Amino acid sequence: PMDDKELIEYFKSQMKEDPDMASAVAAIRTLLEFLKRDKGETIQGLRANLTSAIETLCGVDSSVAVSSGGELFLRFISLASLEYSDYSKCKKIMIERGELFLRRISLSRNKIADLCHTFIKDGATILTHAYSRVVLRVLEAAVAAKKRFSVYVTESQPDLSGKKMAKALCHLNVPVTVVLDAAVGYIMEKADLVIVGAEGVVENGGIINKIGTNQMAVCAKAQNKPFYVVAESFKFVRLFPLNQQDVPDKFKYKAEEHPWVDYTAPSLITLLFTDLGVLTPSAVSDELIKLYL
Amino acid sequence: MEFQAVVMAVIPKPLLPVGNKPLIWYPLNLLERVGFEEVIVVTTRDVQKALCAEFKMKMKPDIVCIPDDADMGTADSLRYIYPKLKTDVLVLSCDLITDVALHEVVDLFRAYDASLAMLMRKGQQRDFIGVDSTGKRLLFMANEADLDEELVIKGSILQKHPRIRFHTGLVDAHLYCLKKYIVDFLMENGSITSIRSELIPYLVRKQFSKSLDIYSFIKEANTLNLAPYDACWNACRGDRWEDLSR
Amino acid sequence: MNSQYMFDYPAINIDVRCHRLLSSVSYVAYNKFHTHDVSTYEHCEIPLEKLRLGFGRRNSLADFYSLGELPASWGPACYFSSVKPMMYTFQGMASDLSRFDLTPNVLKALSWPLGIPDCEIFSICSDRFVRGLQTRDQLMSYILRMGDSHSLDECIVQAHKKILQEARRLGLSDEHYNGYDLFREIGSLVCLRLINA
Amino acid sequence: YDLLDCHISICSPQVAQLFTDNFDYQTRDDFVRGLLVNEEILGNQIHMHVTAKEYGARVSNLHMYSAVCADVIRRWVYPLTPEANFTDSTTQSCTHSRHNIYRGPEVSLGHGSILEENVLLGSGTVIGSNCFITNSVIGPGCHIGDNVVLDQTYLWQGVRVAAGAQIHQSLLCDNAEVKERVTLKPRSVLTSQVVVGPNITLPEGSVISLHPPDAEEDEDDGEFS
Amino acid sequence: QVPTRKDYGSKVSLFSHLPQYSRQNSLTQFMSIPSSVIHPAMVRLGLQYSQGLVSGSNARCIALLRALQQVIQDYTTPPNEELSRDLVNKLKPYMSFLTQCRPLSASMHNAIKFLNKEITSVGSSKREEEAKSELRAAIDRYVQEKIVLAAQAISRFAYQKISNGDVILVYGCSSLVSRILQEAWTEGRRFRVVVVDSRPWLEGRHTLRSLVHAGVPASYLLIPAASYVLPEVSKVLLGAHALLANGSVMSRVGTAQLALVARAHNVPVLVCCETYKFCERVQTDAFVSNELDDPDDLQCKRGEHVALANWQNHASLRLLNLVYDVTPPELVDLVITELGMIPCSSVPVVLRVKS
Numbered sequence A: 001p002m003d004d005k006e007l008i009e010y011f012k013s014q015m016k017e018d019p020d021m022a023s024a025v026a027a028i029r030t031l032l033e034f035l036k037r038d039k040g041e042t043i044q045g046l047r048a049n050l051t052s053a054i055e056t057l058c059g060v061d062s063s064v065a066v067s068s069g070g071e072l073f074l075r076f077i078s079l080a081s082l083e084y085s086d087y088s089k090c091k092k093i094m095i096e097r098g099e100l101f102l103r104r105i106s107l108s109r110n111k112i113a114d115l116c117h118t119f120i121k122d123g124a125t126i127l128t129h130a131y132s133r134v135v136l137r138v139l140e141a142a143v144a145a146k147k148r149f150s151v152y153v154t155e156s157q158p159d160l161s162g163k164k165m166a167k168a169l170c171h172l173n174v175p176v177t178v179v180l181d182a183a184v185g186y187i188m189e190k191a192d193l194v195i196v197g198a199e200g201v202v203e204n205g206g207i208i209n210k211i212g213t214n215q216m217a218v219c220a221k222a223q224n225k226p227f228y229v230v231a232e233s234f235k236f237v238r239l240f241p242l243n244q245q246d247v248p249d250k251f252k253y254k255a256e257e258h259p260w261v262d263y264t265a266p267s268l269i270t271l272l273f274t275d276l277g278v279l280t281p282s283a284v285s286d287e288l289i290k291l292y293l
Numbered sequence B: 001m002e003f004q005a006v007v008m009a010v011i012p013k014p015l016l017p018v019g020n021k022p023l024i025w026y027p028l029n030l031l032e033r034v035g036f037e038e039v040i041v042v043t044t045r046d047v048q049k050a051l052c053a054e055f056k057m058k059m060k061p062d063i064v065c066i067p068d069d070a071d072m073g074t075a076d077s078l079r080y081i082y083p084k085l086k087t088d089v090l091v092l093s094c095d096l097i098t099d100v101a102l103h104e105v106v107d108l109f110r111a112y113d114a115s116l117a118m119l120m121r122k123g124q125q126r127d128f129i130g131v132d133s134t135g136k137r138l139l140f141m142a143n144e145a146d147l148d149e150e151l152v153i154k155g156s157i158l159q160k161h162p163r164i165r166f167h168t169g170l171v172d173a174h175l176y177c178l179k180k181y182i183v184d185f186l187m188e189n190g191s192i193t194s195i196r197s198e199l200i201p202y203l204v205r206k207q208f209s210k211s212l213d214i215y216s217f218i219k220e221a222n223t224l225n226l227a228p229y230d231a232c233w234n235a236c237r238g239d240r241w242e243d244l245s246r
Numbered sequence C: 001m002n003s004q005y006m007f008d009y010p011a012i013n014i015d016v017r018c019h020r021l022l023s024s025v026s027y028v029a030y031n032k033f034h035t036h037d038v039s040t041y042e043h044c045e046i047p048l049e050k051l052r053l054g055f056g057r058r059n060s061l062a063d064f065y066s067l068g069e070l071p072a073s074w075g076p077a078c079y080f081s082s083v084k085p086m087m088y089t090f091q092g093m094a095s096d097l098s099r100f101d102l103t104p105n106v107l108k109a110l111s112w113p114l115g116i117p118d119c120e121i122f123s124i125c126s127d128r129f130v131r132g133l134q135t136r137d138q139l140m141s142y143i144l145r146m147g148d149s150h151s152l153d154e155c156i157v158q159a160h161k162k163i164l165q166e167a168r169r170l171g172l173s174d175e176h177y178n179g180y181d182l183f184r185e186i187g188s189l190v191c192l193r194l195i196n197a
Numbered sequence D: 001y002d003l004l005d006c007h008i009s010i011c012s013p014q015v016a017q018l019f020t021d022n023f024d025y026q027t028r029d030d031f032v033r034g035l036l037v038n039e040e041i042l043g044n045q046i047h048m049h050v051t052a053k054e055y056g057a058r059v060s061n062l063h064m065y066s067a068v069c070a071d072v073i074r075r076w077v078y079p080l081t082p083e084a085n086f087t088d089s090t091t092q093s094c095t096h097s098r099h100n101i102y103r104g105p106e107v108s109l110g111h112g113s114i115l116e117e118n119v120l121l122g123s124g125t126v127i128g129s130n131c132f133i134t135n136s137v138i139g140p141g142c143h144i145g146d147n148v149v150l151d152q153t154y155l156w157q158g159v160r161v162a163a164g165a166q167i168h169q170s171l172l173c174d175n176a177e178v179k180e181r182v183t184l185k186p187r188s189v190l191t192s193q194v195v196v197g198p199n200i201t202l203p204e205g206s207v208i209s210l211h212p213p214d215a216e217e218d219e220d221d222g223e224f225s
Numbered sequence E: 001q002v003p004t005r006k007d008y009g010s011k012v013s014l015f016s017h018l019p020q021y022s023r024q025n026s027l028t029q030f031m032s033i034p035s036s037v038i039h040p041a042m043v044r045l046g047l048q049y050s051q052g053l054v055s056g057s058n059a060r061c062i063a064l065l066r067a068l069q070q071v072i073q074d075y076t077t078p079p080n081e082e083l084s085r086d087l088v089n090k091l092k093p094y095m096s097f098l099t100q101c102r103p104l105s106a107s108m109h110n111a112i113k114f115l116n117k118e119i120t121s122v123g124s125s126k127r128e129e130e131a132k133s134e135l136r137a138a139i140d141r142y143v144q145e146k147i148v149l150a151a152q153a154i155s156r157f158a159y160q161k162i163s164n165g166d167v168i169l170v171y172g173c174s175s176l177v178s179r180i181l182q183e184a185w186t187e188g189r190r191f192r193v194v195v196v197d198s199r200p201w202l203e204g205r206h207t208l209r210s211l212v213h214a215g216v217p218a219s220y221l222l223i224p225a226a227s228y229v230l231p232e233v234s235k236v237l238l239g240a241h242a243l244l245a246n247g248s249v250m251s252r253v254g255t256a257q258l259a260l261v262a263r264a265h266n267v268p269v270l271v272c273c274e275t276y277k278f279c280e281r282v283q284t285d286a287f288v289s290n291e292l293d294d295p296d297d298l299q300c301k302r303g304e305h306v307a308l309a310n311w312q313n314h315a316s317l318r319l320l321n322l323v324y325d326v327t328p329p330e331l332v333d334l335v336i337t338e339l340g341m342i343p344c345s346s347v348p349v350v351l352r353v354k355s
Helices: A006-017 A023-036 A043-059 A064-084 A087-105 A108-119 A133-144 A161-170 A181-187 A213-223 A281-290 B025-033 B051-055 B074-084 B103-111 B155-160 B180-188 B195-205 B229-242 C061-065 C092-098 C105-111 C120-125 C133-146 C152-170 C182-196 D013-021 D028-037 D062-073 E040-050 E057-074 E083-101 E106-120 E128-161 E175-187 E204-214 E223-232 E255-264 E344-353
Strands: A125-128 A150-154 A176-179 A193-196 A207-209 A227-230 A262-264 A271-274 A277-279 B003-008 B040-042 B064-066 B088-093 B116-121 B127-131 B138-143 B165-167 B171-178 B214-219 C005-013 C024-033 C037-041 C044-048 C052-054 C069-071 D095-097 D101-103 D119-121 D132-134 D149-151 D166-168 D182-184 D200-202 D207-209 E167-171 E192-197 E218-222 E235-239 E249-251 E269-272 E325-327 E334-337 E340-343
Touching (some): A023 A064, A043 A064, A043 C005, A064 A087, A108 A227, A108 A271, A150 A161, A150 A181, A176 A181, A193 A213, A213 A227, A213 A262, A271 A281, A277 A281, A281 E344, B003 B074, B025 B088, B040 B074, B051 B064, B074 B088, B074 B180, B103 B116, B103 B214, B116 B195, B127 B214, B138 B195, B138 B214, B171 B195, B195 B214, C024 C133, C044 C133, C044 C152, C092 C182, C105 C182, C120 C182, C133 C152, D013 D028, E040 E057, E057 E083, E057 E128, E057 E175, E128 E175, E128 E334, E128 E340, E167 E175, E167 E204, E167 E223, E167 E255, E175 E204, E175 E235, E175 E269, E192 E204, E204 E218, E218 E223, E235 E249, E235 E255, E249 E255, E255 E269, E255 E325, E340 E344
Parallel strands (some): A125 A193, A193 A227, A227 A271, B003 B088, B116 B214, C052 C069, D101 D119, D149 D166, D182 D200, E167 E192, E167 E235
Antiparallel strands (some): A207 A262, B127 B138, B127 B165, C005 C024, D095 D101, E249 E325
16 A cells, blocks of 8 residues: 555656646546555445545645545545445456546547637637646647637746746747736737636636636626636536635645635636536536536 | 314203294304304203203204203313213303304414413403403403402513403303313313313413413404393393394 | 545444443444545444544544544554554553453453453454454444443544543553554553553 | 603692602602502592603613613614713714724724724723723723723723723723733622722622722722731 | 405506405405314414414425325225325315415425325325325425425535624524524534514514524614625525526515625625425516515504505505515525535526436
């Protein structure tokens, strides 16, 4: 069994060896590998060990996606334990189901890109917040379809990931522009639609994202511009922030008051683009309900 | 069945021409004008245990008369007739002529789930009846016979109900709606002899020790009757106007 | 909300005739989400009906239940324990006495905790006792008999309080008893008071 | 039984005539009882009036004092409110705020102190830091230390309270003084010019003054003896 | 046959399709004293509905289910007849009479539907006493798992939304809100509650007294002054008489007004409701479906005169007291059910998974 050093080292190595890998995917793979090497025979003990490893996996890379992946993994093992009832029989089936689950979630970026690239028109002006690989893949798919468009991206001041995405997008010969986080209200009137990533989809259909997303959502609503969000299926989490203060503090801080995360209400979101398809925000809760019945 | 009708009757008292009809006819007519397909009648037997013979000449649909012994009281009659009692009882008296809508009483028995409902006539020895502000629930019942010198009220009664309205001229019509467990308690205790004289005051006193409630309907503009000869003459005078619509 | 899922529910049967010699906890198949949070100790599931789920890796379980809380999972069976394990290196006498049966001063020595002499604790601490799935009922029945309450979490809290009280009564530097393994602590205490008298 | 006696009567000169006829009468209750029992001769009946939307009550003891003070602060005797200044004077002017907080001129509240509700502060009062005053009336010119707690207490003119005091449901008369770290249990009374020494917890019925016999405990610059 | 209750007074033109009765006039004036057409339990329940002795939605549903259990206990199947549909045919006039006494609520409608489905499901081979016992046990289990356990789950769920030192605004009287607040105070949370009331029922005094007896600090004011206290209010916790398939919340008259004013002040809105009050029907306003109470309840004595004393003498004067109103789904943030905390737009989803 892993001893809090093999687990963290495995997580960091998984992230480092594949820099194009989501944090939640790396966490799920680490949990599956931990389940492979257990050397114990009890479903209760396995659940306890997994849920205890969740905290030490969330100690580093405290993003919401890791917690969502851990909750999804716990629900997965509970679902398997319902069906079989012998830890010995259930172990192999959980291992194989985790293998298929990893293979399925590895294609989420491609599915989202294929489903979403049709919403970008010729001559459109996309507005993006920060660096996200899903939006990058969507724009790559749009370019592969011979569409021509412009892109504005904010600098994301706390860590200049906006410039990183601008570089990664100029690498594809896409005409892009970099704007300040305070220039969003100046730029919204030029853009035709807004595409942002998500670090987690909350129960009501809102999103949890980098600190500058709420301003862009509010400005787009004021200017009546569509606001599209791309997020993977494993980012669904049963949390309901009543407001900005209500989101748990373990997601705001640790990568005078510099939160790293804010919450966007579902009323400001037009459509969610997931590997499950194109959804209204109200759909998300439905899915997140069907999992827990 | 919701109610069982019991008529008290213990020339005799029940046979008394009032508008060419006997005294006992009016309560029976009142009962059978509002449902009451069947009625239990207790027959007096002090003069003779054969009054049911000429009772059976009445034109009412169903009559169940039973002879009695030489002497017996109202509660004693009730504990005699228990074996045929199955639900809430509606105890009446033969000497009662009135035109009140009976629902006005039984509604108080229905809506509030009362343990006792009674009827009284407004004015027109004494009995002191204290009711609440709404004039429906009665909180105090007394007579000067057992009232030594002064009317006495418990502090907690006024604590719960800080306004008590007192009446002295009220006339008891002896029309009672009673729960079954009241009869059962009467069965467990043979001390009580008369309903109006001992049972009802006991129930009123037991209101303020799952709990029991007692309600009274005080009618203000209608008819009432009693045993007295002057009351008999008044009933004879009023029946001519009363019997026109009945 | 995954914290409320259970696999087996402990039904509690308390005997008024003999709360110590009788009364038992029986585990039944319960594969559904519970109404309350769940704690896991030695593969045993405790419904946190009277207590609340806690987080962190602080030692001294006394500080978990001093706040009205209880950890999600702790003990030797947990790979990542939240009690900062310690050994209580005195169970050699417990292993030696495990082969001893019930048959003066030793009688009152074994009287604690139940008030009646018993050798069940040595069977608990015996080396040939794997803390598997088949032993949950027996360990939980021992815990339930020990305490005086209808709630299993309150039974755990009362058990640890009794252990701490006896440790301070005999003067064993109570810091060396954090409730990491209640049965190891109680076996050490019973054997030590047997040796003393 | 639901009638509160406001002790207000509309009388006739016949009332004074009856009082001087029966020279032994001493109270209004005596007059009412003697008149109601003597009804067969000199009828002289008494009537009554009931009010429902108006307020009236007389202060007879400390219980009535506290109840009426709470009612007055909570505007139950409108328009006779503290901010109305119905006795026009420069000293007794104040402003009304949320949760029935009445603040006079130059109150100078400290940092971190919280006024919960139903608090009246007199002119020239000084409040320390991290205080907690609730449901209390504080007279003008009072001086209050730091980290104090006042709950349903009344302080008259010149009251000085040291830091760390805990005062609940007690009355402090003119120029009373409380030393460091003193706790006053409910139903406590400190009369004028009374000091209480440090490190003492007065019981739940303490009444102390400078007059030995009438006071339950003779008071001085000390707490015990 | 049961006579038709007569409308009292003149109705508003926009509400001409709704009945409007008087509290003093009852149907039992034209009914036999020993109840024959309808069961005595049903006539008692109708009298205590019309007079207002049972008001709460949960209380009304519980009373109706107890009366139905009493009816089922005394039911005797006729010869050459089957219980499954004879019992439903017998129950239909009882429902009509109860609707005559006072219009049914959503909880009563759902209970009636559930009981009809249960009765229809009774097999023909079942023997009478076993069928009656099964129906009584089903009614008891429904009451338990749809009121008591649901309230416990909702109270547990709402404990996480209540923090220390926050202000909660409640409206009217509802057992669920009072239970949630009392349990939250018992667990250790410290907070204030603001009670908002409205004429003529003035039923906020019930929850005010409950909170005072529980020890929770409380404030009291009428609905028009609500816009004065919302600046200091942190959350608005409401109870719902029904959740509609479009997410709209049907409740007491001032609920949607309070939601709108709270939205104007940027205050989150939570609505607590049990999943058995969810309705498949939809309505976009309070006009198409509502209940008209006794207009004479609007009369109040201000000073020494009642301005609306002889209001029927004026030919062109009408009185209007609604009982319910509809809150649009965009004014509600949470719906707290025994299933958890859900968005206001997930009402049909629950309706899909409960059938």
